[PDB]
Design a protein around this ligand. Structure first.
Ligand code: HEM
Length: 94
């Protein structure tokens, strides 16, 4: 796809603080900071795995599919292709 913006981990690593907490899931990054007081799970959970792969931490609670679609709302961009291939692959790979 075009237009969309591709972010890298090296960058996200920056916004790894409460002020700006990001999380990568399903080879896709989203805005957690905005979904800090929206997540029916809490904040610590997110922070716990802020600016880092939370595939397991995500699939652990087998996030409902409705979430995979809800995320769209709180979308931010995509995760660099060279980044995803940096840690095998966050959630699935095929
Ligand atoms: C790394 C990040 C995340 C972690 C670690 C996480 C963890 C969890 C956990 C453990 C639950 C259960 C309640 C709790 O103890 O918190 C839960 C539920 C839920 N989470 Fe997350 N979550 C994350 C990100 C997200 C995101 C981005 C969304 C939305 C896009 C989301 C949407 C939901 C919803 C809707 C529920 C209720 C599950 C149900 O469908 O029954 N979560 N989450």
């Amino acid at each position: 796809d075009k237009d969309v913006k591709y972010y890298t981990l090296e960058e996200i690593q920056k916004h790894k603080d409460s002020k700006s907490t990001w999380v990568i899931l399903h080879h896709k990054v989203y805005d957690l900071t905005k979904f800090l007081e929206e997540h029916p799970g809490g904040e610590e959970v997110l922070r716990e795995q802020a600016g880092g792969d939370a595939t397991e931490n995500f699939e652990d609670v087998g996030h409902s599919t409705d979430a995979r679609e809800l995320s769209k709302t709180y979308i931010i961009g995509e995760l660099h292709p060279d980044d995803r291939s940096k840690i095998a692959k966050p959630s699935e790979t095929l």
